[PDB]
């Protein structure tokens, strides 16, 4: 629990065991596996703990020299605690950050010659609101609502002007909005609500906006309030009612309708974008696909709140990403290119160039692209500003060089900047930010940290998919989380590097795509064509196609599942706990999708031993005729046509990775309508309600859970009830939580109450952009330029 | 609209014709009607001015003598402008209501002795939180959620909470409730909270607060935060959403659950209150009614919130009324006597006394009550705390009796105040201020307006039945706004004296028994033990019981009334109208139940004089066989399953009053199922949702209404179909506003977040204490001291 | 000097005496003179106790009825506090301005048939710089 918790040294014998199996080294930097390891064995020498376990399984790190443990202890989520404490004499001894950054720095890279730099965010975040509570952490929005309509009671009737202001300085195409001039004076504008008001109840309520608008314009009103007069009333109303008695929803509603989001800019620099051949290719991940299907969802989201309100423009998305003219047959030559589902969406590739440029030709690695980038930010400035008429209205970041130069292109033209960072390695790589050196000729990490830090300080609000990547969990820290403190020797030591609690975090789950995947319960949309060809792959044989198979015995409920073949997704321990426990042999059957059935030939190696350990499982646990395994790609349609095929005759989907960071294919199945059994580890610990959208299964224990799926496969002459109300389970949580519709209404929205709050606070914030600037001229510019050597 | 609207200068010959036909000194006090007939002739003379007829429409009242004309003008509801024009020449002059009403008073009493006394409640008010919209008055209840909750942000960003410590001062029967230990601090109670939910994710849903209790008691908390271990989790999880960041919503619903309440103390001292037996008595009628079926719902849901809180404690209300010791026929010489349907409620009976007394065996009249009440509230303070265990948590009065009492016992023992007038009668009776010297020796308006303008600025909430009964209509002044300014010569003048924008003020409408009046459909409850007594009522005929109708038209359509016979409940207005159209007559028949007649007195002189019109108009139109006719009273639950028989047999309700304050007649017919057609003027206004819940009709246009009636019968094939859709309106309506299940809940919240707002607010109102305090030893007292000679 | 300085119960006996030689009801309302003169004899019996004596010097008045002694103190300029002591168990208990003039007011002009109106400024100086 903490410091003063190690009084667990009455009962010393224990403690010092402990301390002296540690300092026994081979490493004198110890993380959790070695830490909490060294707890048993010395554990029966002597005693028997349960506060001691408790201690040591909250020990994140330690590091030992000296007579000296320095302990790092995570007691909850998001809290810290440092001590150290001395091999003879047992005394725990607090520490702040920086004693035991110092101590770490000492012992591993020596003494220093000169000072080290403390980059230090604490006095700059003084006074700004925070979150209290770690379970809201991600909520950041509510919190952010409440505290703006809190404080916008100003009752001394100057303010919220801010409101007023605010609904004056927006304009669409050099046309006025909201308000013909800019008014101010509370009373007044109360005044001409009221008599708008009045008159729309003389009006046929479904009056178009350019009926009522010259009447409106005497009144004082420019447009944007709505389309028929009924509308126009609503969010009139809506006004009147805030400038009374503000209230967190009122203003969040009316936040929400302002018709000031019209341009994005969405930022995706590295690899090769474009949609076609994803995945393959370097550095192109279903990194593509989330941003394809997001903008998809934003354009639709942002068409229909602007028609809403009236205003006739056109929205335009740009997705900016860098040109590569050596290309060969992706699209990424191509400067400008029209994404499919959507109107005014386009994709616009900027090259990269030297000083002189002279127009890079050849393809760059994310780890080498630092030098590129700022360059790059000037020329998507000028390009983008060209293609869009002006400003954009939200300019969004992706993974680590996207922030950066979202932060740079934010900074330059005033607008508000969200961050998707989708990974960030500095929690993937332990150790990697103290001995930043060795991984530096590879990776680049100096670069790449130093530009996360600039960017989770510099965004107006930062985009996550989980709970999970921004405070982590009991056990382990945040992504996020990683940033607060750490020491990169030779270059910084960052102390209060992101706060957790600060308003800015979101979680906002992707989901879908819902065209693809939906439920198998569908009146239409299903493609029953498309049956034969599932029949055909599940229940056929032979040299037809490329499987090792034919279960016969199909009367049976089925088992379920498709990954890439490997060894995290963990497709063979699925196959393992399926024999090993014959309970289940006996209840149902495998059907499984990935790598390829027949050799390793033919193709690609690499997986290879997850290959032939499958062949290998196969021939052993003598698992034909019970087990279905496919070797194909199976294109998305027929696999959406599949996974409802699966669902009546009610199938389960398994999905048992080692860990897996968002689970995308469970969100699919849950769609579909498959009852779903998912990884303890990671993601799926959020997405799924464990016995009412679906069940958490440990991948880690065989046999354990094929007692669950057996328990579950029983329950009154199969599954009358059960089954269905699982699936109706999993329909439900994904229809709450996990859409793009819902969470393109969420972004639209956020962009507006960010911009909001970056109106009122902004000018608050200004000694920490002098200092944010001040670190990237001086120590990120600096590193670029070494790489670059 | 305004002061500026007389520059009808335009036109001056039109205007200088209005002031010279004012002028004209009929009266030196021009009220409404007055004025808007000087407006026809002078019409065909000279003109027509349309500005002219908004402005003089717009008069409350003017005060004429000499070449000057005074105005008071009422543009919208609830606000006021006041100005002078010279008759000769004529020109507008800005007015305060102090010169306007300084003026008033020099005209009607003549010039001043000695200077008034202004009483002047504005700097009082001055920074109290007050609503903006005048279509928000009666809300208030909302707004101060918002305010509160606002408040609470900026007070728990900082260190501290106030509504920790109120968390600590409610103890019901002499245990701590909600917390052991006295700690304000809020970081701790967040500790505890997080602690306390987190031991409860352990335990199961159901497990009861009995088992809970000792290990929450070493955890610092009391009983009170739930039955199970469910509803303590739910309760402590909202305390730790207000204590991150409050909201209203989330405030409100916190604040409504703490068992704070379990003792009513009700107020009404005059009249004989008694259970039954009192319909005509004297000071005595309905009034009764709505505290004897109010205090059923109130005790249920008292004990609900309590139980649910996991207290067990058995709540009391005491309804506290006069002891006369002459019987009178009746039981208001019983001390304590239980209302029936209750468990714990009481009518307790207190004496008046003489200053050495000495029981006063008497009745006394409600307008001559006011020397013996602060006696009376002394010696029902004794006896109340007596019989409830200690202080009651809300003081509940009713009338100005009521509401005076209740203003003093509140002070005294610093509980929660409402008031409940039920009327006002400065309204009522014209002038009755100005000239209230005229009217002391019946009405002593002198005491009353005094301990009006007392208990309104006493008061924490005030409940009122309907909008009007606060702020009234674009024409109408309300009953509580004619008290903000007035002048009472040669005692004071009141300016500011109630703020109408105060949030105090909330509607909460009663309804219903519920018992007796529901809905014709339903699968029990009805009955039919009745139902042939019910058809030989209004069927037969003649000289076996009450005449005259004799009907005979099997299947016809009936039009039903149920009422006073006297002037304004005007059923005169109906069958006159009912006569008056051939179409009408031929559609339905129309019955009646008022009236004893029946012969003329014999019995029930003299204002019964209404049965001459009764006959007169019967025999000529020739009504008998078109219309029946009942004398009778009609026992109430008769009347409610006759009322259950007027549908289906299908039929509807009419309500043809002049003016109706509630019409509880109509909520009755609504209760039941029918189709209502109810009077616009007055409360009904607001009951009935026109073409929804029923229909609104002009008692003054004959022709109209029984047209309207008619084109109601006319639908589709005889309304099968649109009679159900007014009817399930109305069974709606009446669910989803008027009953005593929705005002208990609303009054049980109203009690705790007006105790919260008293708690908190009180300080600031220590100076509003003392003016009321001396204004009521200086100026009230010697009032009543004059009666009492 | 203070309602606590009647920890003068050190020496009991001096306190009880020096009720006993007020309470004796020749005035019920004492003023400076008097309720000093009682000082000594009990200054004889028994003791001295300059603390005792620093108290009563800084009483301004007493009210004597029935066990019941209301002082007024006023220890040092502009400064008042008032309690009131029972002549047989004697604890010194803090009155309120307002507990000690309702008694004044009950011993001299006799119970109350009405509530007195009670001025206060306080409500209205709240807040004002002093």
Known sequence: IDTLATCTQQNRDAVYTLLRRYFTANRTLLLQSDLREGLLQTEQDCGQSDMLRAFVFRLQEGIFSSPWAYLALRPEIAKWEFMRIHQEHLIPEKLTISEFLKFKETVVKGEATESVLEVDFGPFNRGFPRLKESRSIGQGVIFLNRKLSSEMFSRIEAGHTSLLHFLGVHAIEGQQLMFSNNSHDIHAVRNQLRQALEMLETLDGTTPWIELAPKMNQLGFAPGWGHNANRVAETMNMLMDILEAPSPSALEEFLACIPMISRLLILSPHGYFGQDNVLGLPDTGGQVVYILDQVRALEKEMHDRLQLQGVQVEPKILIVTRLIPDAGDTTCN???????????????????????????????????????????????????????????????????????????????????????????????????????????????????????????????????????????????????????????????????????????????????????????????????????????????????????????????????????????????????????????????????????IDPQHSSDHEEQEQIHRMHQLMDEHELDQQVRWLGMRLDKNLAGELYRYIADKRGIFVQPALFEAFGLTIIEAMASGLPTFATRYGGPLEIIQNNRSGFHIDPNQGAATADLIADFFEKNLENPQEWERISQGALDRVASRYTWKLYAERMMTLSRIYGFWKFVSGLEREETDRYLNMFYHLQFRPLANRLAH
Chains 1, 2 share one sequence.
């Open 334 to 596: 191509q400067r400008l290119e029209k994404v499919s589902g959507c109107t005014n969406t386009w994709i616009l590739r900027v090259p990269f160039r030297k000083h002189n440029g002279e127009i890079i030709p050849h393809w760059i690695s994310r780890f080498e692209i630092w030098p590129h980038l700022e360059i790059f930010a000037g020329d998507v400035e000028r390009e983008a500003l060209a293609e869009l008429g002006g400003h954009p209205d939200l300019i969004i970041g992706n993974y680590s060089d996207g922030n950066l130069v979202a932060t740079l292109l934010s900074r330059r033209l005033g607008v508000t900047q969200c961050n998707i960072a989708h990974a960030l390695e500095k929690t993937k790589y332990l150790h990697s930010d103290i001995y930043w050196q060795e991984n530096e000729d590879k990776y680049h990490f100096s670069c790449q940290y130093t530009a996360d830090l600039l960017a989770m300080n510099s965004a107006d609000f930062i985009v996550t998919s989980t709970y999970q990547e921004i405070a982590g969990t009991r056990e382990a820290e945040g992504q996020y989380e990683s940033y607060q403190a750490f020491s990169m020797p030779d270059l910084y030591r960052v102390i209060h590097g992101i706060d957790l609690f600060d308003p800015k975090f979101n979680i906002v789950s992707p989901g879908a795509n819902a065209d693809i995947y939906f439920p198998y319960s569908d009146p239409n949309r299903r493609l029953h064509s498309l049956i034969p060809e599932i029949e055909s792959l599940i229940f056929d044989d032979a040299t037809n196609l490329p499987a090792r198979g034919y279960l016969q015995d199909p009367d049976k409920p089925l088992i379920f599942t498709m990954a890439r073949l490997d060894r995290i997704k963990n497709i063979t321990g699925l196959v393992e706990l399926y024999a090993a426990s014959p309970r289940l042999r006996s209840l149902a059957n495998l059907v499984i999708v990935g790598g390829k």
